[PDB]
Design an enzyme around this catalytic site. Structure first.
Site, PDB file in Angstrom:
ATOM      1  CD  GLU A   1      32.983  41.029  36.521  1.00 22.02           C
ATOM      2  OE1 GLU A   1      32.906  40.308  37.550  1.00 22.02           O
ATOM      3  OE2 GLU A   1      32.064  41.801  36.143  1.00 22.02           O
TER       4      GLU A   1
ATOM      5  CG  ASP B   1      33.943  47.104  33.593  1.00 22.05           C
ATOM      6  OD1 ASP B   1      33.292  46.153  34.079  1.00 22.05           O
ATOM      7  OD2 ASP B   1      33.563  47.751  32.598  1.00 22.05           O
TER       8      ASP B   1
END
Ligand SMILES: OC[C@H]1O[C@@H]2O[C@H]3[C@H](O)[C@@H](O)[C@@H](O[C@H]4[C@H](O)[C@@H](O)[C@@H](O[C@H]5[C@H](O)[C@@H](O)[C@@H](O[C@H]6[C@H](O)[C@@H](O)[C@@H](O[C@H]7[C@H](O)[C@@H](O)[C@@H](O[C@H]8[C@H](O)[C@@H](O)[C@@H](O[C@H]1[C@H](O)[C@H]2O)O[C@@H]8CO)O[C@@H]7CO)O[C@@H]6CO)O[C@@H]5CO)O[C@@H]4CO)O[C@@H]3CO
Ligand SMILES: [Ca+2]
Ligand SMILES: [Ca+2]
Ligand SMILES: [Ca+2]
Ligand SMILES: [Ca+2]
Ligand SMILES: [Ca+2]
EC number: 3.2.1.41
Length: 1054
Positions: free
Chosen positions: A677, A648
Site C-alpha cells: 500500500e 504497510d
C-alpha cells in the site's frame, strides 16, 4: 603539525548587559560577526519593530508604524546592543522583529514568552531564530556544534554545506568524549584534513538528494574504523583559525561502504549450529559488545565479551548447545549521536526469534524443533495455488484481526478469545462462518500485525478488557478514578455492561460512550499493531502464554487450522517502514540503540529521525536493513509457512529493495506473493520509490484507490457534509441523489470509467470508451490528476471497497444513501459495491465482516477503539451500527452530519446479515465459477474483456462487461461457455439490455440456484435474447458452448 590551530574567538563568554526590572523586558542582540572585531559596526541603524494585537499583548506602547526606525538600542557594549522594553503586566508574551533599518535579520516574526524566560531578559543573534535565556547561551550556540548536515558517505568522501569555500575544513574525532573547545578555547582533539573535491557519480547515484552538496576528500589512509568508534564532528574555519561552523556527522553512508560487503555474507541472531549456539549481531560502531545470559527468572548467569570481526563490524560468540531456551541480551557500549554520549544499555536481539513476556528479553530458539510445531506441520500444503498469473488472479482476501475474530464470540472457549488458538474452535460461530466463506470461494485470510507489536502490554495483570469487572478497569487504569466514570468502580458491573448502559443517553452533545472507551483504550488488549517491537517473533499477547516459546507453537497451530481445516491461504501485514521508537532511551528502541543513526531515516540537516510514516521512519535504503528485512521475511516464509506479505506504506521502500527482497524469497519458494500500500512517500528524491506507477511490470501488487473511491464515493480526507455529498457508484451517484449532493451526470459518468477500468484490472493500456464517447487508454483516464490505469497485469492490482483503515463500507453507504433508500436497498448497495470487486479482473480484497454489513458506528480510524467499536458479532444479532458516537479527536467534526444521517433506517438485524452473507457467497462463488473472471495476464484481458453501455448517452450506473471465450480470443479457457456477461445495475430504475438480442444468453447456474435470494432475483432472459435487470441488481450471464468452440463475444478494435 604545520597546521593552523582552530579555535574560538579569543574573547570571554559574555555576561548580561542589563536585567529587566518590573514591567520590563530586555532583548540582547549578540553581534557575533562584530565580536571578531575590526569594525565597531555602529548600532544606530539597528532597531526593533514591536507590535501587539493578536496572540501577544504585553507591550506598553508599541510603535505600530512599520517604517518608524526610531526604536533603537538603549545601550551597548563590546558584545553588541540591547533594548529596554516597557510592558503592561510582565506575565504574558510580546511580538518583536529585529532589523537594520527597515531591513531585517531574523527571518521570523519572533516572540518572547514570559512563561519560559521569567526574568524577561532574553538574547537573540543575527540569523538564528532562537530565543536564548542569556547572551552566554546564544554565544555558545553560535560557536558550538549544532545540527548534523555533514554526511560521511563513503571512506574518502564527506558532503557538507558548512565547509564550502573555507580554508580550514577538518573532521575531528574523540573516541571517549565530546569534541569541544580547550582550556585555551582551542579544538585539541585529533583530526583529519579535508581537501575540496567534486562528488563522484557512484556517490551521486547512491545519494542523489545530497548531490548538490559541497564534496570534501579524506586522505586515502584515514583509519576509518577508529573514527567510527567515537564521536565525529566536522568543523570549518577561516584563515585565522577562528571557527565558522561545526556539526555532527551522519555516518550511514561510510558504514555501508566499509562494512556492508563483509557483513551481508554473515547470518545473525542466536543460531543453533551442531557445534552449539552462535550469537552474532551487527554493531560496526560499538566499542564493546558483551553477550549477557539470563536464567528462567531473569538473573545474570554469564556475560561474554564477544569477538568483533574487523571487516564486517559484526560481533560473535560461540557457546554450548545447552543455551537452547536461555534468555539473552546484548550489553552495548556505543556512541549515540543523538545524546552525544557513549551509552551503556542492554538491548534485545533485532534478530530475536523468541521472547520473554512483553519482549524484555530475547531467547535462543531452534524453530525447527518438533516441540514448537503442531503435529503434521512439516506436511502443510498451500490449499490454493499461486504459480501462474491466473492462479494469483483468483486470490480473494479476508482482511482480519486476532481480536476482531473472537473477542465477542461466546461460542469460542473463554481462554481462547482474542488468541491465535480461537481458530481451532472448530464448532464456534466464528470458525464455521469462516469455513463457509472459504467453501464459497474466499481464498486468503490476511492477518493484521501478528509480529511482535509494542502497544499492547503482554503482562496480563496490567491490562483490563471490557468483558471484565469495571473495578478491574479502575485497578489497572488510575485515570478512571479521576474521571466522570469513577462511580462505576464499585458498581459491580462490567465495562462491557457500563458501555451498553451509556448508549441510551449518548449523542453528539453527550458523546459519553466514546468518553469511557477512550480510557479503556489505554489499558485493554486491543490495537491494530502497526508498531514494530521485533520483526520476526509472533506477538505475545495473542498467545495463551507470552513467556517464551509457547507463542511459536500456538501461532503455527493457528496457521495449520487456517490452511488445513479452513482451507485458506494466509497473508501477513508487515511494517518494515518504521520502528516504534529510536534513540538511546525508550523501551522499544532496539535497532537505533545498537547501531545508532543507521537504521532510521534522518533529516539531511538536523539528523533527527523522520516521522513521515507516523513514527520512527526506517531506512530500508541501507544495506544491512535490507538484509534484516529479507532475512525476516525468510523466517516467516520458511519457518511459519506464510503464503504472502502485504507491505504497510510500501512507497517509503526503494523499488530495488522490494524487488531484491522478492528475489531472495522467490529463491526459497517461487510462488510467494508480494504486494503493498502506498500513496504519499515523497522520498522520490532519495531513490525510486515502490509506487503504483514505478512497480508496473514487476509483479509486485499494489492496492488501487481508483475503483475504491469510485464505488465508495469521495476520498479519505472528506469530513462534514462532504461525507454525505460525495456519493459513489455503490451509493447511487447521480441516479439516486441525496438532499445535499451536486454530482453532475458527467461526474457520475467519470466514476464509472474508474470502475470499469478497475473491473478490467486497472491496466494502463486497456482501451475503453470514456464518459464522453472518446477512446481512452487506462493510463488516460484521470484519477485526481494522475493516470488511472497503472498496471501491466491485473495481478499487479488489488481492488477493494472496504478495509481496516477508514470508514467501513456500510458506514460510507449510511453517510451517503438517499433517505428514500430503505434498508434492503442499502443491503443491495453493499452487495453491488462489493460486486465491482468480486467480479473484477483485479485481485479481490475485502475487510473482515463486509458479508455482515460491518459497522464501526462511523469510526473512521479504529486502530485503538477497542473491542467495542471493532465488534463483529458472529451470532448475527446486529452489525455493530449505532453503538455510540465515534471518537471525538478524529471524528468530532463529523458529529453534525452523523446525527443528521444516522437514524434514516433501522439497524440491520439477523435477517439482513443473513441476506448479505448469501449475496456475498453468491458473488465469490461466481468469481471462481469460471476461469474467464481471473485471466491473470494483461494481454489476455485486453484481448477478451470489453464493455457495453458506454459513452455520453449511457444508462447511468449500469456496468456491462463482457468476457470472451470465443475465436477472436484464442483457446476456449472454459469448456462450458463461449463468453460471459457481467451486468451490475446500480440504479433505481429497471433496465433492459438489447446488446445480446437473439444470442442464447442465459443466467448463470449459481444465481438461478439461489432463487429469489439471489442478487439476480427477478432477471428475465427473453427468447429474443433481451435481458431485463431489476433495480439494484447484479446478474452474470453465459453463452453456452456447443460441440466445438463458438464465436463468443469478440472485443471491438476501438
Ligand atoms: O497519508 C495520507 C492519505 O494517503 C492516501 O490518500 C491518497 C488518495 O488515495 C489519493 O486519491 C490522493 O488523495 C486525493 C484525494 O482522494 C482527493 O479527495 C483530494 O484531496 C483533497 C481534498 O479533497 C481536500 O479537502 C483537501 O484535503 C484537506 C482536508 O480537507 C483536510 O481535512 C486535511 O486533511 C486531513 C484529513 O481531514 C484527516 O482525515 C487526516 O488524513 C488522514 C487520512 O484520513 C488517513 O486515511 C491517512 O490518509 C491516507 C489515506 O488513507 C490514503 O488513501 O492519513 C491521513 C493523515 O494525514 O489528516 C489530514 C491532514 O490534516 O488537509 C487536507 C489538505 O490537502 O485537499 C486534498 C488534497 O488535494 O486530492 C487528494 C490528493 O492528495 O492522494 C492521497 C495521498 O495522500
Ligand atoms: Ca534571562
Ligand atoms: Ca508484543
Ligand atoms: Ca488499546
Ligand atoms: Ca525528505
Ligand atoms: Ca469456450
Amino acid at each position: 603539525p604545520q597546521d593552523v590551530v582552530v579555535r574560538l574567538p579569543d574573547v570571554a563568554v559574555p555576561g548580561e548587559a542589563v536585567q529587566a526590572s518590573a514591567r520590563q523586558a530586555v532583548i540582547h542582540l549578540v553581534d557575533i560577526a562584530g565580536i571578531t572585531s575590526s569594525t565597531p559596526a555602529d548600532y544606530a541603524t539597528k532597531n526593533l519593530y514591536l507590535w501587539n494585537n493578536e496572540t501577544c499583548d504585553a507591550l506598553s506602547a508599541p510603535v505600530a508604524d512599520w517604517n518608524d526606525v526610531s526604536t533603537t538600542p538603549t545601550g551597548s557594549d563590546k558584545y553588541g546592543p540591547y533594548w529596554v522594553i516597557p510592558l503592561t503586566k510582565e506575565s504574558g508574551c510580546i511580538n518583536v522583529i529585529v532589523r537594520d533599518g527597515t531591513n531585517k535579520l531574523i527571518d521570523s516574526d519572533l516572540r518572547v514568552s514570559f512563561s519560559d524566560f521569567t526574568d524577561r531578559t532574553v538574547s537573540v543573534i543575527a540569523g538564528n531564530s532562537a530565543v536564548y535565556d542569556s547572551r552566554a547561551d546564544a554565544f555558545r550556540a553560535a560557536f558550538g556544534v549544532a545540527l548534523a548536515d555533514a554526511h560521511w558517505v563513503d571512506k574518502t568522501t564527506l558532503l557538507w554545506p558548512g565547509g564550502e569555500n573555507k580554508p580550514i575544513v577538518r573532521l575531528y574525532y574523540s573516541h571517549s568524549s565530546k569534541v569541544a573547545a580547550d582550556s585555551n578555547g582551542e579544538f585539541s582533539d585529533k583530526y583529519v584534513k579535508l581537501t575540496p573535491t567534486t562528488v563522484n557519480q557512484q556517490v551521486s547515484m547512491r545519494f542523489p538528494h545530497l548531490a548538490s552538496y559541497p564534496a570534501f576528500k579524506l586522505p586515502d589512509d584515514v583509519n576509518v574504523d577508529e573514527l567510527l568508534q567515537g564521536e565525529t564532528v566536522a568543523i570549518a574555519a577561516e584563515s585565522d583559525g577562528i571557527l565558522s561552523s561545526a556539526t555532527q556527522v551522519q555516518t550511514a553512508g561510510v558504514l555501508d561502504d566499509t562494512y556492508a560487503a563483509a557483513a551481508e555474507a554473515l547470518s545473525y541472531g542466536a543460531q543453533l549450529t551442531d557445534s552449539g549456539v552462535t550469537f552474532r549481531v551487527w554493531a560496526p560502531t560499538a566499542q564493546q559488545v558483551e553477550l549477557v545470559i539470563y536464567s528462567a527468572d531473569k538473573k545474570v548467569i554469564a556475560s561474554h565479551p564477544m569477538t568483533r570481526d574487523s571487516a564486517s563490524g559484526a560481533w560473535s560468540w560461540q557457546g554450548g548447545s545447552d543455551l537452547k531456551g536461555a534468555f539473552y541480551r546484548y550489553a552495548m557500549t556505543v556512541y549515540h549521536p543523538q545524546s552525544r554520549k557513549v551509552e551503556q544499555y542492554e538491548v534485545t536481539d533485532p534478530y530475536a526469534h523468541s521472547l520473554s513476556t512483553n519482549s524484555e528479553y530475547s531467547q535462543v530458539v531452534d524453530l525447527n524443533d518438533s516441540a514448537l510445531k503442531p503435529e503434521g506441520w512439516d506436511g502443510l500444503t498451500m490449499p490454493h495455488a499461486q504459480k501462474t498469473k491466473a492462479d494469483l488472479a483468483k486470490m480473494t482476501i479476508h482482511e482480519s484481526h486476532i481480536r476482531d475474530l473472537s473477542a465477542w464470540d461466546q461460542t469460542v472457549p473463554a481462554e481462547l478469545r482474542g488468541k491465535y488458538l480461537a481458530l481451532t474452535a472448530q464448532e464456534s460461530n466464528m470458525v464455521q462462518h469462516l469455513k463457509q466463506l472459504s467453501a464459497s470461494g474466499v481464498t486468503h485470510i490476511e492477518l493484521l500485525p501478528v509480529f511482535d507489536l509494542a502497544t499492547v502490554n503482554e503482562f496480563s495483570d496490567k491490562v483490563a478488557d471490557i468483558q471484565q469487572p469495571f473495578s478491574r478497569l479502575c485497578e489497572v487504569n488510575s485515570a478512571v478514578k479521576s474521571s466522570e466514570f469513577a462511580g462505576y468502580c464499585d458498581s459491580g458491573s462490567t465495562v462491557e455492561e457500563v458501555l451498553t448502559q451509556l448508549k441510551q443517553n449518548d449523542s453528539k452533545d453527550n458523546p459519553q460512550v466514546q468518553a469511557l472507551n477512550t480510557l479503556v483504550a489505554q489499558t485493554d488488549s486491543y490495537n491494530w499493531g502497526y508498531d514494530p517491537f521485533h520483526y520476526t517473533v509472533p506477538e505475545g499477547s495473542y498467545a495463551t502464554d507470552p513467556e517464551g516459546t509457547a507463542r511459536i507453537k500456538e501461532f503455527r497451530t493457528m496457521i495449520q487450522a487456517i490452511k488445513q481445516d479452513l482451507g485458506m491461504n494466509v497473508i501477513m501485514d508487515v511494517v518494515y517502514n518504521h520502528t516504534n521508537a529510536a534513540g538511546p532511551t525508550d523501551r522499544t528502541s532496539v535497532l537505533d540503540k545498537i547501531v545508532p543513526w543507521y537504521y532510521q531515516r534522518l533529516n539531511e540537516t538536523t539528523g533527527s529521525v523522520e516521522s513521515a510514516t507516523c513514527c520512527s521512519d526506517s531506512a530500508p535504503e541501507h544495506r544491512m536493513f535490507a538484509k534484516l528485512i529479507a532475512d525476516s521475511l525468510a523466517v516467516w516464509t520458511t519457518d511459519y509457512k506464510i503464503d504472502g506479505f502485504r507491505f504497510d506504506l510500501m512507497l517509503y521502500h526503494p523499488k530495488a529493495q522490494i524487488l531484491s527482497a522478492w528475489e531472495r524469497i522467490k529463491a526459497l519458494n517461487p510462488d510467494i506473493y508480494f504486494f503493498g500500500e502506498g500513496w504519499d512517500s515523497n522520498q522520490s528524491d532519495r531513490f525510486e520509490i515502490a509506487s503504483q506507477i514505478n512497480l508496473k511490470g514487476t509483479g509486485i501488487g499494489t492496492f488501487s484507490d481508483r475503483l475504491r473511491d469510485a464505488v465508495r464515493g469521495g476520498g479519505p480526507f472528506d469530513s462534514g457534509d462532504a461525507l454525505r455529498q460525495n456519493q459513489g457508484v455503490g451509493s447511487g451517484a447521480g441516479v439516486l441523489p441525496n438532499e445535499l449532493t451536486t454530482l453532475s451526470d458527467d461526474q457520475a459518468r467519470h466514476l464509472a470509467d474508474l470502475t470499469r477500468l478497475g473491473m478490467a484490472g486497472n491496466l494502463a493500456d486497456f482501451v475503453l470508451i470514456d464518459k464522453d464517447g472518446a477512446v481512452k487508454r487506462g493510463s488516460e483516464i484521470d484519477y485526481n490528476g494522475a493516470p488511472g490505469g497503472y498496471a501491466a497485469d491485473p495481478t499487479e492490482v488489488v481492488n477493494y471497497v472496504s478495509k481496516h483503515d477508514n470508514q467501513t463500507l456500510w458506514d460510507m453507504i449510511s453517510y451517503k444513501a438517499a433517505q428514500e433508500a430503505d434498508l434492503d436497498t442499502r443491503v443491495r448497495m453493499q452487495a453491488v459495491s462489493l460486486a465491482t470487486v468480486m467480479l473484477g479482473q483485479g485481485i479481490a480484497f475485502d475487510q473482515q465482516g463486509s458479508e455482515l454489513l460491518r459497522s464501526k458506528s462511523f469510526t473512521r480510524d479504529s486502530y485503538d477503539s477497542g473491542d467495542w467499536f471493532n465488534r463483529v458479532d458472529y451470532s448475527l444479532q446486529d452489525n455493530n451500527y449505532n453503538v455510540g458516537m465515534p471518537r471525538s479527536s478524529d471524528d468530532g467534526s463529523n458529529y453534525d452530519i452523523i446525527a443528521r444521517v444516522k437514524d434514516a433506517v433501522a439497524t440491520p438485524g439477523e435477517t439482513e446479515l443473513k441476506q448479505m452473507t448469501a449475496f456475498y457467497q453468491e458473488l465469490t462463488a461466481l468469481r471462481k465459477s469460471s476461469p474467464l473472471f481471473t485471466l491473470g495476464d494483461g494481454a489476455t484481458v485486453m484481448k477478451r474483456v470489453d464493455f457495453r453501455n458506454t459513452g455520453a448517452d449511457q444508462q447511468t450506473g449500469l456496468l456491462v462487461m463482457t468476457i470472451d471465450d470465443g475465436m477472436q480470443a484464442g483457446a476456449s479457457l472454459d469448456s462450458r461457455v463461449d463468453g460471459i456477461v457481467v451486468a451490475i445495475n446500480a440504479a433505481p430504475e429497471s433496465r433492459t439490455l438489447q446488446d445480446f438480442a437473439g444470442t442464447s444468453l442465459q443466467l448463470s447456474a449459481i444465481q438461478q440456484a439461489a432463487g429469489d435470494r439471489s442478487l439476480a432475483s427477478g432477471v428475465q432472459v427473453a427468447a429474443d435474447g433481451s435481458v431485463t435487470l431489476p433495480a439494484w441488481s447484479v446478474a452474470v450471464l453465459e453463452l453456452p458452448q456447443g460441440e466445438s468452440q463458438g464465436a463468443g463475444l469478440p472485443v471491438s478494435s476501438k
